A paper describes a structure:
Our study reveals how [name] assembles over 40 mt-rRNA fragments using exclusively nuclear-encoded mitoribosomal proteins and three lineage-specific families of RNA-binding proteins. Cryo-EM analysis of the mitoribosome structure demonstrates how these AP2 proteins function as RNA binders to maintain mitoribosome integrity. The mitoribosome is also decorated with members of lineage-specific RNA-binding proteins belonging to RAP (RNA-binding domain abundant in Apicomplexa) proteins and HPR (heptatricopeptide repeat) families, highlighting the unique adaptations of these parasites. Our results reveal the structure and composition of the most fragmented rRNA mitoribosome to date.
The LSU was resolved to 2.89 Å, and the entire mitoribosome was locally refined to three bodies, the [name] head, the [name] body and the LSU, at resolutions of 3.6 Å, 3.29 Å and 3.11 Å, respectively. The universally conserved three-adenines bulge forming the A-site is formed mainly by [name] (harboring A23, corresponding to A1408 in bacteria) and [name] rRNA fragments (A7 and A8, corresponding to A1492 and A1493 in bacteria, respectively), with minor participation from [name] 5’ extremity. In the body, it interacts with [name] and [name] to form the A-site. Moreover, the entrance of the mRNA channel is surrounded by the mitochondria conserved mS33/mS27, the C-terminal helix and an unstructured loop from the species-specific [name] and the universally conserved uS5m. Also, uS5m is substantially enlarged in this mitoribosome, as it has acquired a large [name]-head domain and N-terminal and C-terminal extensions on the [name] body.
Numbering used by the authors:
A (entry chain BK): 1 to 198
B (entry chain B3): 1 to 90, 96 to 106
C (entry chain BC): 36 to 101, 146 to 169, 185 to 240, 251 to 273
D (entry chain BH): 1 to 125
E (entry chain HJ): 1 to 40, 62 to 98, 590 to 867
F (entry chain BL): 1 to 103
G (entry chain Bl): 1 to 200
H (entry chain BF): 1 to 210, 234 to 294
The structure:
Amino acid sequence: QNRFPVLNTAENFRYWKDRGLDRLLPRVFPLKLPAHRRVDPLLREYIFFLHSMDPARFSIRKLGERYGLKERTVELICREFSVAEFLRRTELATPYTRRVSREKAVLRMKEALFSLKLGYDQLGDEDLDEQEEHEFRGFRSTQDWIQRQNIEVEMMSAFPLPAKRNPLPKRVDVDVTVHNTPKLKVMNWIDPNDKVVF
Amino acid sequence: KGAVHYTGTNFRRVQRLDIVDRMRALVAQGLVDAPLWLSAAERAPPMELSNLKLMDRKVHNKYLSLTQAVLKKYPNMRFQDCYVDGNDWSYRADHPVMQFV
Amino acid sequence: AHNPLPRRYPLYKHRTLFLPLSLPSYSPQPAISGVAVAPLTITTNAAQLPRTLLLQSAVRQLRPLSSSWLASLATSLQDDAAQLAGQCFPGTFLAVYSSDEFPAICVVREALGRVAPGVRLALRQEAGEGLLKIFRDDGMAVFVKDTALAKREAGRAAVQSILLACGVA
Amino acid sequence: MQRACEMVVSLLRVDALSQRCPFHVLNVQILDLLQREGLIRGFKVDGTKIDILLKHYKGAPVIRNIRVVSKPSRDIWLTPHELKFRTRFNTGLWIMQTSCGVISHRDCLRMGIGGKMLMAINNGY
Amino acid sequence: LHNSHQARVLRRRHVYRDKHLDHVPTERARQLAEQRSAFEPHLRVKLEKEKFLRDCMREQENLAALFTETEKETLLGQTVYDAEKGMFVREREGVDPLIKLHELRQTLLSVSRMMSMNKQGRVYYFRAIVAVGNGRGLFGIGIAFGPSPKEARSNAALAAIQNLDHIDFDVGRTLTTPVHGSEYSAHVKIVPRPLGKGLKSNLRYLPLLYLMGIDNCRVSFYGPSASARWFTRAKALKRALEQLQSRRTLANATGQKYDLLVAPGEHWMHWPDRWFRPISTEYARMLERIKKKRPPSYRRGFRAAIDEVIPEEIRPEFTPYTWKSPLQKWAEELKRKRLTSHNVYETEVFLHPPA
Amino acid sequence: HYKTWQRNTAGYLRTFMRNKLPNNEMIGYVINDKHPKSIRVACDRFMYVMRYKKTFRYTKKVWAHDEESEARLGDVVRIQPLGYRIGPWKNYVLVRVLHKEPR
Amino acid sequence: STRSISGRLFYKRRPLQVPKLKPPNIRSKWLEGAPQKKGICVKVRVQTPRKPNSGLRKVARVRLSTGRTVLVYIPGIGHNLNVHSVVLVRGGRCKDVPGCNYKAVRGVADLLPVKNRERKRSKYGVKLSSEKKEWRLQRWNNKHLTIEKDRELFNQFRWMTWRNEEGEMRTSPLADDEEVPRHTQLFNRWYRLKMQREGK
Amino acid sequence: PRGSHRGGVFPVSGLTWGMNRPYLKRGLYQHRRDHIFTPRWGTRTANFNPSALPDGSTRRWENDAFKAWPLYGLPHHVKLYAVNEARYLVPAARCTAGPEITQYILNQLDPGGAGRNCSGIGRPDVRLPLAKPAAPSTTHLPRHLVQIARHVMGEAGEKVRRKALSFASTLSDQGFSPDVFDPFGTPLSERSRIKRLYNLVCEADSWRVKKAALVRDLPLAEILYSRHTHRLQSRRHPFWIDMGYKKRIVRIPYLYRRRVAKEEAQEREFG
RNA sequence: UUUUUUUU
RNA sequence: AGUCUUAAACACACCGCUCGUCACGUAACA
RNA sequence: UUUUU
RNA sequence: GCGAGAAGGGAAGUGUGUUUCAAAG
RNA sequence: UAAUACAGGGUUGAACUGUGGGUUAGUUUCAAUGCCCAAGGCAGAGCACUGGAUUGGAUACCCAGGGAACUGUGCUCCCAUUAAUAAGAAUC
RNA sequence: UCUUUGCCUGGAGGUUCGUACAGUUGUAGGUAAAAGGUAUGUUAGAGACU
RNA sequence: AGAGGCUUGAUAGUACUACCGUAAGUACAUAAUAUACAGUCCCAGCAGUAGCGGUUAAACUAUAGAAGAGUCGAGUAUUAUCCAUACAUACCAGGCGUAAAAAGCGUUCAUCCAU
RNA sequence: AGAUCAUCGAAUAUAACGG
RNA sequence: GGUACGAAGUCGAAACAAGGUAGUUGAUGGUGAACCAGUGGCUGAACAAAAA
RNA sequence: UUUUUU
RNA sequence: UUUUUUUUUUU
């Protein structure tokens, strides 16, 4: 009835989804795992070393570009590596006997099993910067919270139609730091709604 | 209480779908395989009939009043074609009375 | 006064934070330094996209500081076009130019930005034969070309010609 | 105002082609807005009564539900910021009576002026 | 509004309101105006045009389609396999064989019991109400009777199949407006839900929802009946609840206005001219149109170089370059060799050691 | 008394505007002009109901004062309040007369 | 509909139309809103329940402190109330006894001893936990229930190296007449920890 | 405070009571995970190793483990992706229109512009697998620089470098222009992969599948089995929950032995 | 490869 | 005697259903 | 309360 | 010399309160 | 409920009028039968009342006599309360 | 579809111009089914006929 | 069972703010039951509108009736209180045939309604 | 200084000034 | 005097269906208990019931 | 105290 | 449930 060969149509939205009797059918799905753990442990040591050696030449952003790592992911590698080494050199406790919540214990098992089947990743595979793309991220993505409407209705006419009312930013209160001392911390309360600045 | 809505659920508003529309959904849903005659009717869909009856209208019969005057002046029209069926005098298209009016 | 947490089988799984962000303005925004900053899709995650980071970066840079009626319209349009054209001496694409006529069009190109920044004329090369024609969007020519006074007059006619059919009074 | 509420009974018919309606100044303006949205095929003022045609599609009519909000005995008013809450996530048609004539609910929010909800077309709950 | 005494002594524009002198366009008023123009050109009517050649010269053509003696003289002279189960099943038994029985689901509602009086004692016969319908776009309710509860269930399901009706459901799984339903005391209000949230209803009636094919909805029963039993009235509520639903494709066709969703952009209204722009052109007639069409003098398209694309296998990821770091080259070499293996990589092994 | 959320609804705001006039002025019709330099002005007010969302009307008869005694019975006039008490009944002052009844 | 709103007096006609009364708390109305009220008994009789319920139910007319008399039921086996006895009543309706809409409270009342025989319901019968019953809840030692399966497993992988309790390693588990020893670390872990802790 | 539940206390799995049924008594049974659909991406070992030499030969992979850790490097996806590429770019392949119409069609099929990573499909400087040979798109090149460069380049790069194969094919692109060409021999080979169609084929492997009543029933249990959204949440204290598992360590084994004790003893004295 | 599966 | 039509407050279906005076006992408006 | 088997 | 009912429910129905404005002893 | 006198309502024709209205208390007429009071009588009917029937154990059923009640400008509306169970406007 | 008047909230119950005028459903001892009805059966000194 | 109060005849969908099939206390140890059985027998009782108790019913008493089958937990449970969960306290959001509800028929005052 | 619904107890209504 | 509930005895056959010779109602009269006689109104009324 | 095991 | 942080949408 209509021609639209693209991948952002109503029917093409959320491809490979159960629409019918297949919703109740059990299906296995891949297990997610953070990128900072899938990398080769060997490379983590190397990356940490560089960071700790010369932060100027080896910045947080430049270091992650060569190995293809995000600015946030590379930060955790140094932080997690530091603590592991600190307890070994100082002869405090072994990493295996370290106390940690159950959420991390299950994560460690997955990391070991991930490599035992496929293997560790020699180089990360992720983009440093994001990209505006059409994807389904939760139920709050395909909804307009400003006008609170799902279906947009407009008049059909060839002539220029009047534009819609643009929204205004929401003014909220914030706090800033002016003077900081060991025995006292002074702060300032900002009120954007005040006409007189002074 | 009971069917007290002249303008409401009393008057159904169910969409009328032909065979072309019904078959298109079943085949797509995967419930029934595509028959050999599915494409035959696709190129020549049937003509809509619901909208044709809307043009029907009722008109007033003017022969009831006009024929009264004709017989009054010339009441010798009932003799012709008297033994034939359909004619009553207590008329057929072929009757003189209908021809003149 | 609440601490949400899972209470079911799925007690350990990736739970990414989502920050819905609708369109900031429905009006058509131009490209900043040639980089488009228009919205492509409505689905936006918490992480700021590089395209949006450019618009917000430049926002903080802007400082807070800074008879008949028909006959009159044409009368003012001609006067304004002539006055503006004479200031440079003492938009549509498809403007061809010859190789040997580059100096003649170079001064005109650079002179339109001083009085009409909206002009976005382009340059198209062609076999060098002394030709200099300026075409419009609809495919109509507005200036056809066959001590220093002759050179100045040639450029004067071109500046006013484009403004005559572009200016709105 | 009373004659305005008498148009829903005539326009809300299934097995019919054209229905009459009492002539009124306010009623004429309402029909203009509905025709723009494609709800009424056409209308004609036949003197003391107005003849309005009915639109049908696949048997069923285009109009399926009519709700009268405003009544002669009272008056419903909503602020520009309150109409959005009422009307949200819907395809319905609300007739708004503003100072500058009569317009739909979509245009009322654009101007930000306080209108008056008269009637509802193709509205659910 | 507020026709008080004070308002009545101020809204009077004049002492007399001459309504008979008003100027309103009537039917006879316009008729007289046209007739006055004709100097001393009147109303006329036209009769239907009856032509015999319309059907006389066309009916003969239809005869050629059936003039054959083998198609004119004649007039005017139980099991189906179920491969994963493998057992005989009744096919017809008053049921359409065309419809697949391995794609539908049933949900038992209730099993009521009745009483019958006779000359000797009492006779009891069971009954059931089984709703059968595909969980994609179909729904149906059937009712029957039987001597025993087991037989009643089977008979009730039979009627549901034979009374299957289509629904008007959105492609996008998003309703327009909330529908409401009634029969006597009952109210069944269906509250829509956002896309990607799932269903939310009573656990008892949960299966029912699925059977309907409705996604992202909150179905609640507001007192199905306040007297007697509540199963019979409830049967008719479903029927006159889903008929009121309307999809985008319905409203847009009659509304002739923008009726698009938020995520997609102009999917149903956008109709590119695929029979005017992509029209075929041969090399034998192209030379004739070059001297007649406008010469190409424009600049608005840069990506205008494409032709018939032939499927070709490429590996952009594994492409050594002069700017890649030494570590990247090494890492890609090992990865490439693993995917090209056809002896170890494309194999499934249960145990870890070669047992 | 009205709640905080009841002071922002269109129904209450519209009623308020009708009642509210410059200098707390009022509109009413005279019903008694027997005593010298005295006229009783009957004013009509409005109120809003947050339960059924309906506005009613209730008359408010008050006494006024006239200098030239131009106003007569059945004549809509304008009144203005005052920050004192003059006479036993007099509580208002005339400004002008809008409509005049024949004799 | 909105037919009931017509008229300028809509604010005085609609609101005066009360739907119904308050079905809940309709029987217990003589308490003056108090949870409980004390009273004194002046009449003891046995009221026969209505048909088809047979048998006999013991009842007594208790005079409330507010100068009102109402019948009260005495649930539970036995009977101790007599003439001029103080008893605390509470809420509760009795279907078998017509009119009675109150119940007595055992224990807190005056001159009302504890029930005769009851173990299941403790709070209801205001019965305190007896010392004998409390001691029984602490005895938990029934783990030694070996079977033939354990015997075979023990003499396959746990008979070569196994330390006994007193002073010896090598034992004789293969003998049928002998009994396999118990675990000295896991068996009876909960009972051992509690007994060894209270001994201080 | 809120103590015990006041209601039906229906089970999480959604099963009925009665004899000859999983559940006997009414209860919640929150601890029973067996009834809940769960994946198995780990491995299980055997109870006894017959091998004399201690070795981990009893380790076996799980059925769900293969699909739990997939790898987007298998060979049988590129072939399918290549075929879909031709069918996806057909709207512009058969579009015999001007540059303006062709450019718009390609934009919708693949978003690409300034500051965005595009696939390079349709650009003048890109190699495509055309059905028949065709000349490059030399229309965008300047005419002034090419004309002046043709003389200084010399005969070496005027008739043997690029012009030797610039007119070997009958067909061409964007018309014909024998005067304007590229004397330099710069090969515009290589291409880029798409980010939309490639991600769809890769995820296709995660949805693959290998007196009776006419109409099959739909038990409630089925719904709750796979889906975890419609399942009632836990309310008991964690401490109690954890203690329940510890209790069963020594309790459970006793129940099994107590049952067989009576049956085994009965046969040894009567049977 | 750590008193890992394993549990006051 | 076997059917048809109509009525019915019964359907353990006319051995059905149901009402009133008087006699004894327990109580709230006294 | 006690505490590297 | 300065401060002190800092422990007040006895009065009132169109009142006590609320809202809109105003106040260079 | 034939004749005659007084004065209403409905249908149609002409003239005039040029928004005159729907509902209705602190309101006003009429209103079967029965009862008080009053006027009354000489016909046809009958409650109470000893006037000829009951029973298979109790009765007013079936005859006859029989002093209340049956025409009011009045006092006066209790009812199964006088032409359906809505006083108005719009869709044929 | 719209304007206005009037009326009801399961069934059910009350001490043993002045003897005038006005006015009235409601503060219980008690109860869990009163009731409209489509169809079947049965009864009928109630009508008809093999 | 680091530890006590309730239920143990049917009936009740057992709560909702992040996540919304994108995952293990996943496997061995480690699997069972209470509509088995004991006492009284229109009597003693239980209970929630409907009810059970006679010849023995998972409905009354009893858990050395078995390391109680379940829900809470250092509390649990009964009564009581209010705008008492759509018994819609009825604009949203109930009526005036038979069922609880339209004044015997009519002209007028005020208010509301109307072109 | 201006404006600013009254409700319960079943109910029982015309009152005060000058010839 | 009258009314509620429980048990249950004697004296009677009023309602159902034309047997009590139709039966509820407004106002009276009368009778150990069903209630009965007369007038008005209603059906919540049974049987019977036209050619020249 | 045993069994299993990158 | 963050070694050198009193910062951290930790999960």
